[PDB]
Amino acid sequence: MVKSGKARAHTNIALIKYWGKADETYIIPMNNSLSVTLDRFYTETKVTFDPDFTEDCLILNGNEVNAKEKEKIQNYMNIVRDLAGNRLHARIESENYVPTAAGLASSASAYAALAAACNEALSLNLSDTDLSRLARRGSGSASRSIFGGFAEWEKGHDDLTSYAHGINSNGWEKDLSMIFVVINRSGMSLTRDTSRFYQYWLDHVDEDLNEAKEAVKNQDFQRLGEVIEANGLRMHATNLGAQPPFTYLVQESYDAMAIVEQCRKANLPCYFTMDAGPNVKVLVEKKNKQAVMEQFLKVFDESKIIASDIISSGVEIIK
Numbered sequence: 001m002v003k004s005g006k007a008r009a010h011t012n013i014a015l016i017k018y019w020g021k022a023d024e025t026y027i028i029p030m031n032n033s034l035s036v037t038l039d040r041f042y043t044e045t046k047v048t049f050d051p052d053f054t055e056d057c058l059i060l061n062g063n064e065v066n067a068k069e070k071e072k073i074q075n076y077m078n079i080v081r082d083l084a085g086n087r088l089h090a091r092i093e094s095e096n097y098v099p100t101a102a103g104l105a106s107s108a109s110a111y112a113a114l115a116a117a118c119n120e121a122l123s124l125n126l127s128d129t130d131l132s133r134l135a136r137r138g139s140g141s142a143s144r145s146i147f148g149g150f151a152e153w154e155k156g157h158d159d160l161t162s163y164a165h166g167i168n169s170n171g172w173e174k175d176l177s178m179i180f181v182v183i184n185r186s187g188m189s190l191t192r193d194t195s196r197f198y199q200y201w202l203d204h205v206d207e208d209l210n211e212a213k214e215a216v217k218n219q220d221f222q223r224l225g226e227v228i229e230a231n232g233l234r235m236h237a238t239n240l241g242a243q244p245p246f247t248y249l250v251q252e253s254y255d256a257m258a259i260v261e262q263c264r265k266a267n268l269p270c271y272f273t274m275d276a277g278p279n280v281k282v283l284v285e286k287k288n289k290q291a292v293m294e295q296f297l298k299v300f301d302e303s304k305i306i307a308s309d310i311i312s313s314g315v316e317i318i319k
Contacts, residue, residue: 004048006318011041011111015228017235020192030160031205040308041098047117049088058092064157075214091288102182111138112145116315132163147314149173172219172308177289179282180306181256186246225271230272256280
């Protein structure tokens with residue numbers, strides 16, 4: 001009579017950025033976003049519900065988490081109980097296979113894996129939509145880690161309507177790779193709240209989205225690359241307009257970017273994006289991956305350069 005289940009969910013990188021919430025409580029975003037799920041980085045999470053358990057317990061990477069995390073996870077589990085129509089508390093044992101110490105985010109793979117594991121443990125047989133909705137309340141980008149390849153989070157306007165879906169690119173994702181250049185108060189809320197350049201972000205984001213969607217239909221790498229690169233830069237521009245301004249970028253970040261342009265001028269097409277920190281991520285065709293990396297290795301330590309393929313499949317039950 002103990003109910004358990006285990007799942008694997010991979011991280012994903014936003015090509016059309018989710019930046020700013022319409023609703024802070026249900027994690028409803030100001031705009032749609034588009035990502036690619038990565039083969040190399042994932043979370044594995046086991047959940048076990050027991051009538052005897054008196055509260056929710058999380059072991060992450062072997063260790064009990066602190067008090068603040070316990071509170072955060074307990075609160076999410078509430079949503080799960082509510083949805084499942086029960087009152088069982090759970091022991092969660094999770095391992096992140098994500099280089100978080102190098103600055104890569106784990107919340108998208110974490111909540112997606114925890115969602116799917118709960119769906120399994122409690123036999124909810126949630127649709128992918130509903131699975132995405134449940135991951136969403138934990139972390140916006142988790143909503144997209146329910147799927148592989150290209151995924152779009154439709155912003156909707158409430159809990160029922162805000163969720164993601166997988167985009168079929170006729171296998172295009174099998175041809176793409178991503179290089180991570182690991183690089184040596186403030187956030188989307190501050191920006192979405194006070195940025196003088198936020199409306200500029202809003203006025204362009206949909207067009208970027210569609211042009212990006214159009215590029216994926218035609219498997220048009222250059223056309224995809226150009227728009228996601230400009231979109232990513234605009235996101236960081238919004239933070240420059242925040243009250244007061246801030247930036248996630250450091251000089252090394254600009255050095256990686258310049259190496260990307262040099263690659264482009266030298267017959268190795270590739271485009272960069274950055275998120276809530278100085279790491280630079282390089283979208284490149286798998287055919288050109290080794291060579292782009294070579295140009296980076298001329299400048300960076302081999303330990304600071306990491307390649308990942310794009311995975312085709314979505315969140316997965318472990319048996």
